[PDB]
């Protein structure tokens, strides 16, 4: 029942789309886990969704560890935690230290940002038992994707990428790919919980769908998300 | 409305002069923002204007983060640039990144560092990791106690530009030289005591408001004198910068 | 007193080495008196003592604490302490610092997990007077993360000067080949009886956990009237080469 | 207001520079008013102020404290602060961190002890805005631990690295003269003859604060005067008139 | 007068044997200084003699600085040599320097480190920065839990690195003699024969403080005298007369 990296690999091979959503609290993590969400992303997006800041840069490693521990008490699903700004780019050794704290806090994988210049860090961590989700995002994108794949990234995440390009990347790398605003050709999808639940007022990002509307329970709204992700309904045009 | 690096690049291409002024308090930052200042420099010059010291060297990273947070609560559209203080970034590019990351977390949109070609590697290290850098060359206050010069300055400018510097700031540079640099580097240039051919200008707020006694420096103009309010003084500065009448 | 020299003489003589995990003074004294030659203060305490789902959260402070506890109870047995996750993989210098704290806490040897990429660290520590037990095969610290690789890992640590090589859940035939290939003594768990010694988590072999025993684990409490008798039986079977049996391999 | 530029112009004009150690605000103000151009907040305070047998126990905190004290008393004089034993020899990076603390405390220049092996550190600091006074010859920090060519090499190494000043202690006068005529930067001497570009003495030594006879290269300037102000002015006058050091020193 | 590195070099040159003993307290340090002991070793052996531990590995840098300060308040002319404790100096030459600097600040005049050729780079690093180094080779207690040409290579490496003194422990006398004759610096031995330039013993061992049989290369100098003062003077005298070790 527990979702592992092998689980994601089998799903990629079988073509079964992976459902990912952000999570920052125990209650919602538990709700999403039981609702079918395979990967829970404790992302630095909490700097805006939870802390109410204008950017994610001020989020600290302590903040990430706190929310990771919270989510871990609630959730079978795999917990992925973001290495926060400034906590891992100094060197691969610093990255390892930070990632280690996140793993000790309950994470099963850590997410880092950067292209080819970060590939050495991906390898350093993966070789030491820390699964890595490499966040990237034409030829530059492919190079970044390959670099991290070669380095052993467990998952490659793309944000705001041409559908056609994402498809090519997904077929080029051996590891599963996850996307947001990158089309349905990716091995899976991810959305910020608060966004797909219509927590924020006014229109929503073009690449985000409100799954709250149409249902009278968050539990149903999430299941609908998972459903459309596997049915390849979402993302649509 | 928000001023971004892209905004500055478009201004450089259009020949629209950029107005920068130092800021260390929320109230004045809001006033300058509303008066049209496009870049607010939370500089280590506060070591002298705010702390009353004889030089900027004693300013700490905590001091810079504090004033950056203050300015951030008052700024609206203007871009906030924060100085990496003496001793907090020159040990290594790794130390510089650590210090710069603290400033960005405090509210900065760009950090400024002083030094020539020997600091270019640090500029590259920071920019590649998401931290925009303003490279300060020429007469650098942090080294106040310390033909060929022309080429040396040009090489410093090119090194930082090639390293990815978002902006190059020149202080006390021959007008003719500064013009050549501005026409050579791809990034916008800002000057003080460097002529009006730079892509923009900067002055210490307290200097241009005539807060200090005596005569103002040669490359500084008192904008409070001859104007009816602090707001008007700042608007006058922005207007003369864009009209290319300042510096004269 | 059990020294590295003792272990090497035993490997040469074909006399099997008995190792068991230990996290408390009382049990350590009991196992020492019962003939256990190596006491492993392992990060397995993260599960047996702390009740966690993995060993990753175990800190260096935790390891030093249990090492000090075991040192107050042990007498003749050699104390081996695990370097916990995150405390030694950053660099060989960090590993040395962490291992030094464990030696200061009473350890006589430290255990680290990793393949060829850790051989440089093994060398760095051994040269500085810190005996190293190199753990290869199934490494719990990388649970969230083949045959030739195992051989390469063993050879690399042996060449780097590892005092002992420990293998977990490895096909018997392979374990046998490794043991006959490296110069240092080998210890196994779920690796067959051809290793130079064996190790088991104390709580597992005492039947402390409910449910069926792990495949490579034998309940030594059953059939005996005391914890002392259970431990003595384990030591006896290891030396008699009756454990692990075909069923535990 | 004394700057590095001032010192260079003085070297070129042959005007001897007067330097004296200072550890308190009151004496610093007195020396500044008396014409002393360089105030050395030296680790010699380990003996003159702290009463120790050597300068090795002096800490960076002690140096910053005395530097801050002197900075509240000095007006025109340039403040030079010693990097204390242990605070800068680990690496050029450590030296910079230590030197930066001294500059933050009020120093205008820092002094380090060492030969060619320290030149890389001199360059590192100077390039970063920290003026360096390189101390060669007899270096008190190494008190527990052809030879003329080595001194020349040490001086040239630091000069080439960008040292603002080179200080020589207990060196053959003829040798000190050659060095002074060779390096581009000003030289300051103590027990190195009068041909250096300037002189330095420990305040307490030249004020006769210690019992017994002063060192051979030291002159008691208190004798013959009835005010510290006059004693210091006599030192400045004799240094500039080149009557000190005399043949006897 | 005061015993300096120069004093030791002159003694080696003249063949005058150097007397060294361990010291961990001010009172005993003063007594040994007055009795003619030329080198006082504030050694990590205090982990066993003072702290009562089974090995010297648990001794900390704080412990070493504390005992060094204590000995420095009692000593007058003798040279104080302080051991860099296990874990405090082997990480890098930079770490060793920081640790050694703390010991010098605490009152040491020289620091001792354990290790062969692999530690010579550290010896050079410290010596160049004004910290005299005593290189301890042979049987090193810090490696207790873990040949002729190896010893010679270790001695040569440290001498070439500028070690002020080379200390040999438990080495064949014939080998120790060759080393002493080949290195430029003075040698001190314990269980290394009498052909070294000097000798050292743990104070507690030579005063017969521990119960049990006397260690092979150790002599009980307390026996036959009724004052610790006389016991120490006897040790110094036998070392000088080359009658100890026998």
Curated annotation (Swiss-Prot), chain C:
HAMAP family: PanB (MF_00156). Pfam families: Pantoate_transf. It is an enzyme of class 2 (transferase). The active site is at residue 168. The keyword Ligase does not apply. Mg(2+) binds at residues 43, 82, 113. GO terms for cellular component: cytoplasm. SUPFAM superfamilies: Phosphoenolpyruvate/pyruvate domain. Gene3D superfamilies: Phosphoenolpyruvate-binding domains (3.20.20.60). Signal peptide: none annotated. Binds 1 Mg(2+) ion per subunit. This is 3-methyl-2-oxobutanoate hydroxymethyltransferase. GO terms for biological process: pantothenate biosynthetic process. Catalyzes the reversible reaction in which hydroxymethyl group from 5,10-methylenetetrahydrofolate is transferred onto alpha-ketoisovalerate to form ketopantoate. It comes from the Bacteria. Its main location: cytoplasm. Belongs to the PanB family. Its EC number is 2.1.2.11. It catalyses: 3-methyl-2-oxobutanoate + (6R)-5,10-methylene-5,6,7,8-tetrahydrofolate + H2O = 2-dehydropantoate + (6S)-5,6,7,8-tetrahydrofolate. Keywords: Cytoplasm, Magnesium, Metal-binding, Pantothenate biosynthesis, Transferase. One of its GO terms (molecular function) is magnesium ion binding. It is found in: Cytoplasm. Pathway: Cofactor biosynthesis; (R)-pantothenate biosynthesis; (R)-pantoate from 3-methyl-2-oxobutanoate: step 1/2. Its cofactor is Mg(2+). 3-methyl-2-oxobutanoate binds at residues 43-44, 82, 111.
From Swiss-Prot, chain D:
This is 3-methyl-2-oxobutanoate hydroxymethyltransferase. The gene is panB. Its cofactor is Mg(2+). Mg(2+) binds at residues 43, 82, 113. The keyword Cytoplasm applies. Its EC number is 2.1.2.11. Binds 1 Mg(2+) ion per subunit. It comes from Neisseria meningitidis serogroup B (strain ATCC BAA-335 / MC58). InterPro entries: Pantoate_hydroxy_MeTrfase, Pyrv/PenolPyrv_kinase-like_dom, Pyrv_kinase-like_dom_sf. It comes from the Bacteria. Gene3D superfamilies: Phosphoenolpyruvate-binding domains.
């Amino acid at each position: 029942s527990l979702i592992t990296v092998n689980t994601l690999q089998k799903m990629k091979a079988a073509g079964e789309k992976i459902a990912m959503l952000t999570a920052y609290e125990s209650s919602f993590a538990a709700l999403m886990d039981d609702a079918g969400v395979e990967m829970l992303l404790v992302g630095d997006s909490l700097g805006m969704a939870v802390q109410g800041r204008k950017s994610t840069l001020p989020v600290s490693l302590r903040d990430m560890c706190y929310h990771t521990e919270c989510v871990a008490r609630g959730a079978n699903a795999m917990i992925v935690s973001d290495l926060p700004f400034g906590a891992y780019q100094q060197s691969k050794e610093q990255a390892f230290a930070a990632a280690a704290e996140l793993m000790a806090a309950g994470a099963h994988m850590v997410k880092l940002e950067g292209g080819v210049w970060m590939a050495e860090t991906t390898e350093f961590l993966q070789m030491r038992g820390i699964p890595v989700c490499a966040h990237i995002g034409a030829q530059a994108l492919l190079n970044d994707a390959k670099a991290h794949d070669d380095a052993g990234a467990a998952v490659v995440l793309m944000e705001c990428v041409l559908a056609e390009l994402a498809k090519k990347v997904t077929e080029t790398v051996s590891c599963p790919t996850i996307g947001i605003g990158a089309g349905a050709d990716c091995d899976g999808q991810v959305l910020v919980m608060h966004d797909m639940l219509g927590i924020f007022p006014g229109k929503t990002a073009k690449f985000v769908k409100n799954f709250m509307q149409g249902h009278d329970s968050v539990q149903a709204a999430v299941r609908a998300y998972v459903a459309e992700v596997k049915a390849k309904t979402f993302p649509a045009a």
